[model samples]
Target: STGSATTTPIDSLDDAYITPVQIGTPAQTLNLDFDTGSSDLWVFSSETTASEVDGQTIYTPSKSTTAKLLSGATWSISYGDGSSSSGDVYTDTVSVGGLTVTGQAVESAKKVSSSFTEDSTIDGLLGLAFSTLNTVSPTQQKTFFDNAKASLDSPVFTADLGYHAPGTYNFGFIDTTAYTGSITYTAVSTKQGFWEWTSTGYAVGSGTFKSTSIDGIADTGTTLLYLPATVVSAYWAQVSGAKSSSSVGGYVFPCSATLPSFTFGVGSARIVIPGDYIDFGPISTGSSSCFGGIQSSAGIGINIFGDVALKAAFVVFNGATTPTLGFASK
Candidate 1:
């Protein structure tokens, strides 16, 4: 109920890659990452400074055979990890899967460091989350769903994240054969543009029920689940002597080991985290109560349910039909 199946890279277009479309009369391609943790679809370009962009490979729009700048209001996005970028908005054609969308708003970052560029290994990220974080304005607004919904064939867009696993990331239209029956969607609340959902309760180890409500964005960009203070402490308590490591930003234990199962309740839904993921490879603290996976994000903006839970189910996003997140057993 926790670990994800590994996806090996594939050569065919059927694999999990978004094909970009050019905006102008003549078409070009723009690659995008199918990210859910944040909003906005961004691409790296040659105009971006090599020094500022880190880890990611920049896509040069200027070099594109058919590319034009929107010349609309430009903007920048900054993250808690202390990384940021600025880019101009362009109305371009972008393609995900085999579907093509024209007049889509594409972000072209102008300032990027080598670190961001190198780490990304990808050309850009396409935020598949809800509409709240979209940078596109009324006149220039065009989302991956708004423009390309017709061609997708299906009403929902499914995330095929490779994660730390092996599969390629997939987007646009859920593949029914991949799971049991039809997907079920959770109603969404449009608060600050974040697709917020309700968590009915929280359970740790085999402890008694602790009524709780956990809310925040479900982000594919992030790699961990960050919970509120009381929640983190309460959950960790079930693991007995497991304590938070002051040295690392993420949670860690004294040794590589396992703990009892932990479950989280979302409204009427309950998802369990397997023990193998708890330690994430623990160290020797002498004693032997393995660490837990739930980490502390006291100052972090929101409680992000990252790959820790995402890989457990087949996540379906239906922004075009309904602003919601659907889950199915993988």
Candidate 2:
């Protein structure tokens, strides 16, 4: 079956896009965040405390005839932001877009940190990184994409993330209409279970591209672009009154400051990040100070090409023998 599906983004909180998925025999639907940075398909379920499950649509496996517990198996995760969830596992049929994977492992959360509980819109995470990153114990679980790839005519999926607007995620096929120009492909290094790649260098504004290499992951779950501290400092320095303010978090600049476009080199292709995209709203409502979407990746170790950077290009997450990334102007 050469089936493919396209999913439109649901209303998001802080640019976190959610896609609807169906699980179980009769098809219990859940809105999931399709995260590319990490792997684990977990949902708020009956095991989760009521107080911790507020505003979330919890999955009830007992109600589904096809849902079966993976005896003695468990799953847990601690996110980059310190949000976490842990619980038992169940094997069930999982469907996304128009594709289905039978006997897929679904982690049911019995415990959750305040970050997950407080962000009510995200019911669970549909990990798209790599199956090796799955959090199950004793044995790892395959991601929804990994389980479905062999059945697809082409082992690929595309993420068309938008800027403060609903976008689409297409599976199994690349919709040529979604992008313009030729797709520039790059080999990916998945040793860390992430879509990691190296940028030859970057430049602030229309300046010449620097030769300083940067290693980073393309993270759909994150909302900002994080680069090396020195690179962040250089970009911020171009804007008047820009400073790394602890009170504001990250670098903040006057809202009215004239911003410059940022560019990164992938192989020989240069992808540009618009100046306006760097201004990530105000530090606080009605505050003349605004947070810069491009921040320092000081403690994070690896840089992150988050939504701010991804939204500027059409991205292809190729899942063949040697995973690769294809990017083009949208």
Candidate 3:
């Protein structure tokens, strides 16, 4: 069987890709961040205190007859941005779009950081990375995607995000209508539990392609594109008023700065990210300073081709024994 789901931006920032997920017997629906950056199907739950609940929806397992405790299992996960959550584990029927998986391990949050509580739009995260990243103890559980693969027409999923607009995530089949050009296949290394691949080179605006191999990961969960400081400087050097500020903690420029387009290679294919996408928006409401969608990933120790690049292409996460990534301009 195959399935597809509409993924929408939670706000104007388009900081995350939110998709509806159904859990338990009665089907408690929650808007979950379908994150490929990390693995652990976790959510806000009854164990989370009122002070930490904020405006996010909680997944109450007690209300579901199908919910079963995972015995002594528990989990805790953190992110590169410093946000984190921890919780007990439970097994329940979980469904995404029309794809269903029985006995899916669901991490029910017992505690969460202020950063998570402050974000009201996303209830939890449904991890799509390799199960090797799962944090459950005593026993590791495969992700909903891994479990559903047995019944899928083909073991693959595709992410089709378009700027700040609504996108679609399709499982088992690649929707040919979602893209314009031919799909370019590339080798994927999942050793780091990410869809890591090597970019043949990059070009700034109409400049020449460098032809150097840049190792990076395609993280749908991450909002921005982060490369080496040298590479980031090269791109920002062309912007008139761009500078990395201590106050803003990253590169920022005038809201009206003339930004240049950035391009990267997937195999022999080229995917260009427009200047409009690089202008992440103003630092604050009506502020003259604007944050850049592309930044230096020196702190993270690896380049991340996040939404800034992924939204520019149709990405196919092939879940074969030796997984591969397919990219096509849309």
Candidate 4:
């Protein structure tokens, strides 16, 4: 049977989208961020200290009769943004929308970073990345998507995110009506456990598209678009009064600065990010300074086409033999 789910954006922070998921025997429902960048289905749980739990909801495996501990199994994960979590493992029934997997690995967090504890709205992460990226120790675990894919008509999922609005995440199907124009497909390299692709070129504002190949991943969990230092410099150079602010973090500029549109090449297709989306709102509520959503991916090695770029288009995460990605305007 086919399955699908609705994803909603969090209030105040439009960085990531959240979807409802059911875990364990009696079906403990939790709001999870469907992250395509990393793999490992983890949740704050009874094993976590009260102090570490903070304002987040906890998932108690003991309450579910179907939950079975994977003795000696453990997991630890660290994100690009420094957010981290570690925990033990359990096998239980997990489901998203109408799809169900009977023996799914569920990592229950015993500890989490301050960044995760402070983000009270998200209950956990529903990993959509390749199963090879799963962090369970001794033996890697499979993600819910991997386990449920065999039952699907097509090994694919589609993400349609809107700025500050709800969207849909469909599994095993592509809704033609949800997108505009033809979906341009591109070959992806999954050896790195990410949907890594090479962009043929890029352009700043109305400037000519430079034929520079850029290798990056499409990361739904990340909040901002991260590019090479040279690419970032080119965009900021066009913004008057813009400077790399150590005080504000990343590049900051006058809120009234006229930002230029950014475009990236995806084979023959060109996906453009609007100028306003690049502004990323003000550094502070009433501050005259604004932080850029596009920054240098320096330390991370590869660039990241995060929510800022993904929200501008409908993305297809195809999990076929020669895995590929498809993009269409939303």
Best lDDT goes to which candidate? 3
Give one clash count per candidate, in the order shown. Answer: 39, 0, 0, 0
How far residue 4's Cα lies from its native spot in candidate 3, in Å, is 0.6
lDDT of 1 by residue, 1-330 (tens): 011122322222112233333333344444454566556677777777767665545556665555667766575667555766667876666655445666677788776545456544446667665555666544445456655656555555665543345443344545667666445567767665655676667777677667777776666665566788787777666554567777555555545434656566655666666655455443434545344556766888677776566655667767664578776656
lDDT, candidates in the order shown: 0.58, 0.87, 0.92, 0.89
- Check candidate 3 and list the clashing pairs: none
Ranking by TM-score: 3, 4, 2, 1
Worst 10 residues of 2 by lDDT: 4-13
TM-score of predicted structure 3:
0.98
State how far residue 22 of model 4 sits from its true place (Å): 0.9
Tens-digit lDDT string for candidate 3 (145-221): 89999899999999998787999999999999999979999999998999999999888998888787999998999
lDDT of 2 by residue, 198-287 (tens): 888998998988987789998988878999999999999999999999876799999899799999887888789888878777767799
TM-score of 2: 0.95
Model 3 alpha-carbon miss at residue 177, Å: 0.6
**Per-residue lDDT for 199 in model 2?**
83
Best by TM-score: 3
Assess the local accuracy of residue 302 in candidate 3 as a C-alpha lDDT between 0 and 100. Answer: 90
- Report the Cα RMSD per candidate: 5.9, 1.8, 0.9, 1.3
Could you tell me how far off, in angstroms, the CA of residue 97 lies in candidate 3 after the best superposition? 1.0
Question: Cα deviation in Å at residue 212, candidate 3?
Answer: 1.1
Report the CA-based lDDT of candidate 2 relative to the real structure: 0.87
